Design a protein around this ligand. Structure first.
Ligand code: NAG
Ligand code: BGC
Ligand code: BGC
Ligand code: BGC
Ligand code: FUC
Ligand code: CA
Ligand code: CA
Ligand code: CA
Lengths: 113, 257
């Protein structure tokens, strides 16, 4: 029927499906509309937090986090003290893309070393 | 690759040929450019080029005017894996190389000349936005724009429009991506033929433009004329398969006074 009639009405590599006396387009992920000619905006749901920036890609969304934040939705404030940085029983103070080591007396330097 | 960032280098002024470190070029500043396009960040520049990076070959020495190249590739081309966000950050660096012009970035003696930085908002369009950057040592004059990939339309290049003239459609492309129906066609995708002028909307149809075919029980150029009941001799019709007797006639098929 409709699909064998030459070219492809579904534009972005979508599959042609024959209805009766007509057809419908099986759109690949990230495409909508009758004949898949429109790029779906994957960033409508505003998935990412912490003042990030959403990038609408083909079939998926990508977010650039503000410095110090991470995760797919930029939902995680990175514990910069996770690696146990301050040595010799120093104290660790996490902030944002930044960490400070409280230095006990007799020790100095960035890592209190 | 739905949208494209275009960057045209126009003119670069660098008399004396001075590097960043204050040393003069020897023998002259064989200048190539590194471009870094990334997202708008009000805070200090951190991270890589998220929108894409590109290095150019040596374009000139010291002060020179840059010509367009249809096939270097000026204006520069940056295809994006994403829809244009509207905001951006642009980093243009001028460099010097003692090595070959083929891939100047692949040379050990590379030294920086000068660089500039701009960020802000930009809307998709064929309109070139031009800007100058003057300093005591160097001057840079350039222009840039964001356009849609070929056959792509809309404010965000998110709609595809390839022109058709076959069974699936007969249309041209409007700037917003919506089909512009060819003469004699209608519908969303312009695949519905416009029947002959005056052809009965209810009783007539067509498969080709300016044609008029009659649904069962009708005839004529406009399919507006009924066909009386088979065997109707002295009677008329308004609706197919009828036999409304004339004057002085009667009976079902109208044939007896
Ligand atoms: C940059 O320098 C040029 C000199 O050729 C001058 O014409 C132009 O106005 C300057 N741009 C400014 C001052 O913004
Ligand atoms: C399939 O149906 C659509 C409307 O849904 C029509 O435009 C096409 O002509 C038909 O093949
Ligand atoms: C909207 O947010 C959801 C999170 O559930 C994500 O899966 C979608 O891709 C996004 O458009
Ligand atoms: C984990 O430890 C490393 C030391 O290698 C430090 O650089 C990081 O800041 C910390 O998170
Ligand atoms: C995307 O990145 C974030 C971090 C902010 O700088 C935004 O303004 C930008 O659009
Ligand atoms: Ca069908
Ligand atoms: Ca998309
Ligand atoms: Ca933190």
């Amino acid at each position: 029927d409709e699909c064998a009639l030459g070219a492809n009405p579904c534009e972005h590599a979508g599959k042609c499906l024959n209805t009766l006396g007509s057809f419908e387009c099986q759109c690949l992920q990230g495409y909508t509309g009758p004949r898949c000619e429109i790029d779906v905006n994957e960033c409508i749901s505003n998935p990412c937090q912490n003042d990030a920036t959403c990038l609408d890609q083909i079939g998926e969304f990508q977010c650039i986090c503000m410095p110090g934040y991470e995760g797919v939705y930029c939902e995680i404030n990175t514990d910069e003290c996770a690696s146990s940085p301050c040595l010799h029983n120093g104290r660790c103070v996490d902030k944002i893309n930044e960490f400070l080591c409280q230095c006990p007396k007799g020790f100095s330097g960035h890592l209190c070393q | 690759s739905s949208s494209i960032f275009q960057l045209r280098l126009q003119e670069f002024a660098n008399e004396r040929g001075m590097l960043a470190n204050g040393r003069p070029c020897e023998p002259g500043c064989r200048t190539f450019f590194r471009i870094c396009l990334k997202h708008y960040q009000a805070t200090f520049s951190e991270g890589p080029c998220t929108f894409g990076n590109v290095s150019t070959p040596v374009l000139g020495t010291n002060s020179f005017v840059i010509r367009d190249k249809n096939s270097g590739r000026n204006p520069l081309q940056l295809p994006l894996n994403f829809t244009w966000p509207g905001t951006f950050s642009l980093n243009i660096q001028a460099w010097h190389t003692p090595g070959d012009d083929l891939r100047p970035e692949t040379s050990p003696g590379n030294s920086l000349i000068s660089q500039i930085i701009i960020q802000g908002s930009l809307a998709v369009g064929k309109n070139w936005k031009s800007d100058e950057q003057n300093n005591t040592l160097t001057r840079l004059r350039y222009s840039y724009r964001v356009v849609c990939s070929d056959n792509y339309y809309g404010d965000s290049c998110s709609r595809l429009c390839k022109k058709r003239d076959d069974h699936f459609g007969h249309y041209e492309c409007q700037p917003d991506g919506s089909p512009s129906c060819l003469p004699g066609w209608t519908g969303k995708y312009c695949d519905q033929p416009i029947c002959l002028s005056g052809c009965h909307e209810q009783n007539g149809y067509c498969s080709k433009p300016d044609e008029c075919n009659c649904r069962p029980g009708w005839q004529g150029p406009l399919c507006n004329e009924c066909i009386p009941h088979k065997g109707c001799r002295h009677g008329t019709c308004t609706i197919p398969w009828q036999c409304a007797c004339d004057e002085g006639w009667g009976g079902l098929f109208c044939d007896q006074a």
